[PDB]
Paper text:
α-Helical coiled coils are ubiquitous protein domains, found in a wide range of structural and functional contexts. The structure of coiled coils is understood at a level unrivaled by any other fold. They consist of at least two α-helices, wound into superhelical bundles and held together by a mostly hydrophobic core. The seven positions in a heptad are labeled a – g, where positions a and d are oriented towards the core of the bundle and are thus mostly hydrophobic. We find that they indeed break the α-helices to form short β-strands, which associate into a triangular supersecondary structure we name the β-layer. β-Layers are found, also repetitively, in natural coiled coils, where they form regular fibers with alternating α- and β-structure, a protein fold that has not been described so far.
Residue numbers in the entry:
A (entry chain A), B (entry chain B): 8 to 67
C (entry chain C): 8 to 66
The structure:
């Protein structure tokens, strides 16, 4: 019982500490939209590069 | 005591597991930094697309 | 013994709540990939801005 009382006090402290620093699902709720925007940027930059390359040849 | 011993044992395993699997507030800070970079990029790319369109018209 | 079982009961409830609300390392596993792509995008957009400025001047 002396052991079990100390262990519970340890767990209490451990739970409050990890609760303080744990990321929640709410915190990362935006992740899919962030990924989408990176994907959008990859495409738009690719197409911009192609257009700029064509323009660089036309201007000469 | 027989219950406590069993319950505390499982609780310790669960808490250890949570600590290992969890993402943290530091990861959230990093996500927010990335969001800020992406937002800047979206703005820059929009402006670039507008300039390129103007140049395409004027070169033609 | 009874008060310990009470505190353990509350703790089990707290842990179950945390387990359901937890975001995990596997969940954000794509974060480093996005970070790498974004660093490359920053570089590419820098170069695009430079080339567009040069073309604007020329035109």
């Amino acid at each position: 019982v002396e052991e079990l009382l100390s262990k519970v006090y340890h767990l209490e402290n451990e739970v409050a500490r990890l609760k303080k620093l744990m990321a929640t699902k709410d915190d990362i709720a935006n992740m899919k939209q962030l990924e989408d925007k990176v994907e959008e940027l990859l495409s738009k930059v690719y197409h911009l590069e192609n257009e700029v390359a064509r323009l660089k040849k036309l201007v000469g």
